[PDB]
Paper text:
The flavin adenine dinucleotide (FAD)-dependent glucose dehydrogenases (FADGDHs; EC 1.1.5.9) comprise oxidoreductases that catalyze the oxidation of first hydroxyl group of glucose and other sugar molecules, using FAD as the primary electron acceptor (systematic name; D-glucose:acceptor 1-oxidoreductase). Recently, fungus-derived FADGDH has received attention as the enzyme for glucose monitoring, especially self-monitoring of blood glucose (SMBG), exploiting its oxygen insensitivity and narrow substrate specificity, in particular its lack of activity toward maltose. The structure of AfGDH consists of two major domains: an FAD-binding domain and a C-terminal domain.
The bound FAD molecule was refined as a reduced FAD cofactor (FADH2), observed not only in AfGDH/LGC but also in AfGDH alone. Both FAD molecules showed clear electron density maps for bending of the isoalloxazine ring of reduced FAD. In the structure of AfGDH alone, we could not identify the bent isoalloxazine ring conformation showing the hydroquinone or semiquinone state, but it clearly shows a bend, as observed in AfGDH/LGC, and was refined as reduced FAD. The subunit structure of AfGDH is similar to that of AnGOx and PaGOx, but the recombinant AfGDH is unlikely to form a dimer conformation, according to PISA39. The β turn between B10 and B11 of AfGDH is directed toward the N-terminal region containing a short α helix of GOxs and is located between the N-terminal region and the corresponding β turn of GOxs. The observed position of the β turn in recombinant AfGDH is expected to prevent dimer formation due to the steric hindrance at the most plausible dimer interface (Supplementary Figure S5 (b)). Unlike in GOxs, no residues from AfGDH belonging to the loop between B4 and H7 lie near the active site, and a cavity is present in the vicinity of the substrate-binding site.
Residue numbers in the entry: 2 to 571
The structure:
Amino acid sequence: NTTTYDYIVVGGGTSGLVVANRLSENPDVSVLLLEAGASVFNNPDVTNANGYGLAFGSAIDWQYQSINQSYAGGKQQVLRAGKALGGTSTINGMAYTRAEDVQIDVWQKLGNEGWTWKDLLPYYLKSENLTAPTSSQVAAGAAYNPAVNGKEGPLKVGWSGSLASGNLSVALNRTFQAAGVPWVEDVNGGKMRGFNIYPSTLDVDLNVREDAARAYYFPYDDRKNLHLLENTTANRLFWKNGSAEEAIADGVEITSADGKVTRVHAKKEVIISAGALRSPLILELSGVGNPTILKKNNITPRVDLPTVGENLQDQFNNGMAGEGYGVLAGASTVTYPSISDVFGNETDSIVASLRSQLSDYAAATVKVSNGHMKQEDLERLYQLQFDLIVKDKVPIAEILFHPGGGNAVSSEFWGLLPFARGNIHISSNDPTAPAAINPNYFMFEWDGKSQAGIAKYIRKILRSAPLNKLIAKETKPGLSEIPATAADEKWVEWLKANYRSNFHPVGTAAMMPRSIGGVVDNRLRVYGTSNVRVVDASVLPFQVCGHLVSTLYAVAERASDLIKEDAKSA
Ligand SMILES: Cc1cc2c(cc1C)N(C[C@H](O)[C@H](O)[C@H](O)COP(=O)(O)OP(=O)(O)OC[C@H]1O[C@@H](n3cnc4c(N)ncnc43)[C@H](O)[C@@H]1O)c1[nH]c(=O)[nH]c(=O)c1N2
């Protein structure tokens, strides 16, 4: 009847809008989107291509709070997320970069059939429409490889209309030679190491931010089989009652803006796309998760899957600055250094120490999931990551350099692959209550040591020629606070005191085999259910090197094909 649809997609965000778009391509399938926020079509702080940061702390920022971070000096961290049609794509930094090919290949090696770079690449392309650079932008260093960028996809990608060459970016380009990191034409072809003028998620015909709604929703909102409920919060799924021990989702419980708490039903499937900080909570509230936590919070267990909310992996981000003799200008540049780029002469002794620590990191992570992940299993997971870092020389850092205003040069930077793992769990069965989110930042020695290594490497870049002729001094942290010959620990103290979340959480409904603590299968179906999937950052089993939206769009495009395929029987 009147609350029944074929599919229900929970969360009209980065990933959810893809799935809703693709599923509604079949004009005889009905799709309901549920979104807690609303349209931001006309929110200027979203729409503004130069508006990054403006929306922080507003009504469209969930502004989730972590617990005290006991490995990082005790402070709680704000974890930002978009509450809006388009989700976190509405408030993010707009950077478009993907992942290392061999790091996606690891997903299949781990036991997830069909997930490799070769499998995913067509779906990156399918999502994308890249606008080639103008002359001004080419002189500023903009480039791309036509073979790895799409031209028909919903997500417009391009460079700023204001991009121009300037003394800072020109000097940086040459100074990177001294540092040993080559220029590359396109970081998005599976090999990310180098430095590059990366494109952004931007509509250059409007000069607006290209969020997921501008891409996958508004051009398609004429489809009468695609339905949207804004200001509508999904609280939990409910189930079909009947002695199928395997759980069949019947629908979703929802709260509307003006108070009505009701149900909507799905004839085929329910797709959960609320993000890595909410999808696992929705599962827990629906009885899918750790039965000890569920029972404690007065929820009946429906599926005993105790790693829902576990294996949370995030990065942390720090910032450095210097000051020119005069005004610094030009492009914003990304660098993706490997372990040997960052540590140079000392790489092999750094690698040996790391090697010698893996089993201890694994032993220590066991207690985080109260023994639900076994030591053996964490050792094998950490070995896959170690082998990427060292054997395959994937990038271990992102470093952004940009003009900071007038005299200023600013660098933002993060380690890509820390080993720390945490979790997120409901604090009660009230959907409106804040979860306990613990990413465990700085838990393991590598996580801090690598960040300090990156900082030391930036400091050296700023002092290298020809860039050094432009730069009078370092202003942050500056030599007074952290002297030129300072030890790793001196850096780690400062970085701990000054870090923020990089807002890249993954893993909270991980796609791995159930036997090593997976929550979803290789077709993104929740274990123990017939017809529930998770399609968002929750399912990435490991961190990726680049900025998340590109990979999340690709995963949602591929997921969509799998869902369609599965329907051509049932
Ligand atoms: C400040 C900042 C800056 C950056 C980034 C993040 C942040 C916070 N990122 C990361 C990237 O933007 C992010 O990982 C993805 O947008 C996440 O997409 P998801 O689909 O997983 O969740 P996303 O958060 O997009 O979608 C979840 C949706 O579910 C909704 N929702 C949640 N709970 C619900 C409920 N119970 N009921 C109904 N709806 C619900 C939310 O409101 C939201 O619309 C980024 N990436 C990048 O590629 N380039 C960049 O430059 C940056 N920079």
